[model samples]
Each structure stands twice: as C-alpha cells, then as structure tokens.
Target: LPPPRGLNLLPKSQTTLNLTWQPIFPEDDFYVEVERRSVQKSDQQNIKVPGNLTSVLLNNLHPREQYVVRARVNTKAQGEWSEDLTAWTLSDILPPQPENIKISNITHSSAVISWTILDGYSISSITIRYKVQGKNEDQHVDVKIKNATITQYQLKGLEPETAYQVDIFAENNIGSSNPAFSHELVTLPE
Candidate 1:
C-alpha cells in the first residue's frame, strides 16, 4: 500500500483545493484515496489516485462548504482508510470589527486602550491610530500600530489635559474594514 506523509492543504480558490502529500513508496499494487463527505451528495465519496502521486487537485469544491479530507493506502481492489490528515477548506474572510473599545489608566503622558473582535473570526493585523486634536501646533503626536494577537495597546507621549481621537482597523486575509472610531480621549492633568 502507498501510505502518505506530510499531508497538507494549500490556499484554495472557489473551485479547487490543492492537496499535497509525501508518498512513502512508488506503489504499483496499491492506490491512494482522498475521501471526503460529498459537498452535494448525502454520502461520502472517494477519489482514487495513483500510489506514487505526491499531490492531487480536488476540483469543483464549494468555497462555503467545509471539506475535511482523509486518505489511505489500500489494494487496488479496496481497503480501509488510513486517516493521514484532514483540513477545512478556508475561505477569504472579511476584516473583523473590534467592539467595546475602552480607554483606561489615563495619565498625563499615556493611556491604555483595549478592544475586542467578533467571535469565530480571524484577524491578520490591527492598526491602532491616534493623533492629538487641533492643528495649531508644530509638533504632532500620532501613531499607527501593526498588531493583531493582542487586544490592548498603550498610547503614550500624550500631553496632559489635551483631547485626542483614536481609530482602530482590523484586517484579515481578504481585506480590511472601516475604522472603529473612539470618542474624544482626554488626558489627565499631571
């Protein structure tokens, strides 16, 4: 039988999922099968492939449907599946919206801000932008941060008793969304 190793799924389009694996042997007596629950049918389906093939292209797949694939090596006649690996076909996701934006630990020089993303969503990056209010000064205090894993950030170097506006933008694989605006943030007196 032709057992495979290093099974992986690559970036997929709306129509196909690229399945890559390492063949254990150049099998001639046996074959490999990539099995999946049918996207349209009620029962499962098996895609028979050459034993020595290291990669297979599963075409005409649904972008919205979850496709978990499993493979195994068996005699050309038939055999049990060998569960090497499985994966969900990922879709391009829209940027997540951060909620419950909060400002805390305000001081004359800095303030801590926090926000949350919607559940069941993934983010590639988060941009935290802030600038002091008014255009009457020569020196501008502003920042744009690139972070996604952390939900909180500290805005520093703020003048005491000054007002500022902040915005946050969360992005994913597909693209970004509109910025989440914060109310006028005022720093405390020193």
Candidate 2:
C-alpha cells in the first residue's frame, strides 16, 4: 500500500515542535512514534506520542538545535516508517522590553492610555491592568494587534479627579513582553 499523506511540521514557541501526518489506508486504527537525534551525531532517541494520535508535541528541546523527526505508521497487517522531517528551533534572541507607558485624557470619569510596541518582533496582544490607587475594583483591557492598523484603549467610568495606576504588558506566541507603567492619569471633575 501507498504511504500516508499530508505530513507536516508545526513549530510552536521556541522549545516546542509538533509533528502531524495523515493515517495510512486499510488501517481502521493508527499508531505513530517519533524519533529524534542531534544533527552532529548519528545516535537517535525514541520519543513516545499518544497512540492513535495524528500529532505529537515535543517540548523542552534545546533552542536553535536542528532536529530530525520521523513518523511510523502501524496497522494490523503492515507497518512502515516515513521519511524524517527536520526543523530548527528559534535562536536565543530576546526582544527588547517595552517602554514609555503613559496614561492621558484626564476627565471626571474617563481617561485614555497608550504605549509603543517594541520593534523587530511581532506582537500578539497588549494587556492593560489598572485600578484606582485607593479603590477596591481593578479592571483590565486587552488591545490586540500593534500593526499600523489598530491601537489604543479608552478607559471610562473612573472616579472624578482620582489618581489611577495603570500597568501594561504585551504578549506574543513566544511569551509575554516586559511590563510598562503609566505615570498617572487623574479624571477631571464634572
């Protein structure tokens, strides 16, 4: 019988890799196993994946290391191993921390907050968590996307002339970026 189809690799985060492939024909059920080895050496290590699973996620791997991943197909009648697929993990590149977070639009009940996204790396979303310095309620807003398309969040329902502390953090698939702080924005009195 012909080998399985639709074999692919998905690289998630800096330390995780996912392997997926189509199941073989005439095989009512399927089983897959993965093997990995350092490119510099010939020795291979067998990695276990969930049975009857089409995808396997390999975690805690060395960053920037080349990996050879292979998938084996097994059925009641026959079995075969597919060609090894290879992928390299992200290098040890750390994005610069975000900076210059500030709050503005002081009003009796509302204010606007904004910040700059760091350069180079892509941004997934930005989270702004704030609370009145002395109030019991804390709220947060998520600003998704930093591209030239969309930005900024206006916070309303704040106390009049009351100082509020706001903290912001940006997150991507890799991880959350450094947190930025807004000096302070006081709502205007009505």
Candidate 3:
C-alpha cells in the first residue's frame, strides 16, 4: 500500500546510468520507465521489478546528456505516472561545471577559494586562474593542481584590499570542462 519514493540518479560512469528508488511493497510490484529525448527523437524503456528490488541501471549512455526517469506501482490498465525525475549523465571527457562557489578567509595578501566538485569522478586535475582587479603581474594566478578537494584552493600574495577575478577548470582523461567563474570579491582590507 505504498508508492516508490526518493527516485534518484546514482550513475558513476559514462557507459552506465543507474536509478534508485524506495521500495513500495513486498507483494505489490512495480514498473519503472525512463525516457530519453534528442530533439526530434524520443526513447522510452520500461522494466518490471519485484517489490524486493528498487534499482535499475541503463547502459550505452552518452556523456553529458540529459535523461528522464519515472516510476509507479504496477497495475492493470495503468495510465498514471508518479514521481518523475531527471538527471544528466556525467562524462569522462568534458567535465561538468563546478558549483557552490564560496570565498572565505580573505586577507589583504591572500584569500581562499572553494567550490563543489564537478562531474569528473576520475578527474585528472583542476586549473585555477585569478587576476587582480587591475593589471599587475604579481597579482595573477594560473596553476594546475593534482589535488583539489572541492573545498580548499587558496590564492596567495595578492594586492591587499583589492578585487580579483577567479576561474576553475576541471579536467579528466577525456578533456577539460568550461571555466567556472567566481563573483566579484576583494581581499581582506588591512
């Protein structure tokens, strides 16, 4: 007497996309259908799973593509679709955009930059670039780091009390992602 809940995308590779959901019933069964649309073409695949099961994995997925998933309890003459979900497949190449950009611990001569991880699970490295609000060779930053924790990347020895521009690029085995930019910000004033 329950319906699937918490439909989520949990894929971890370019060749596979997996969907998971809360199991509804021990006796009642389910049919999960996921859809993919490409401009003039649309594709849908449906699979029936026992109530004891709650996950499905689809393959041959293209990198950085959009896909839709929906689930419902199986019943005769069924027409209602419940709890639709959508997600983008990650790419080994063309890393996803970094998100949740945060700036903190700013000092006249230094400041810290951090952001959520992009989709490159196998990311090779990240390139960080920054420039002082005005042109000064010492105020520039352009370096690639092997270790980025999606949290800590610091810019050092800047023009005190000055604004700077920052950008992040995630790279993997395939290629690099588009640069993610930070909002206008200034180093801490002394």
On lDDT, the leading prediction is: 1
Give one digit per residue, the lDDT tens place, for model 3 in 34-71: 44432223666566665567777877776666667766
Per-residue lDDT of candidate 2, residues 120-150 (tens digit): 3435566766766765665644444454223
Q: Give the Cα lDDT of each candidate.
A: 0.68, 0.63, 0.66
Q: Which has the greatest TM-score?
A: 1
Compute each candidate's TM-score over C-alphas. 0.65, 0.45, 0.53
Q: Write the per-residue lDDT of candidate 1 for residues 29-100, one digit (tens) a residue.
A: 777788866444464667888776688888766543456678877775555555635433444566567888
**CA lDDT for candidate 2:** 0.63
What's model 1's TM-score?
A: 0.65
Q: Which ten residues in a row have the lowest lDDT in candidate 3?
A: 32-41
Better of 1 and 3 by lDDT: 1
* Residue 121 C-alpha lDDT in model 3: 48
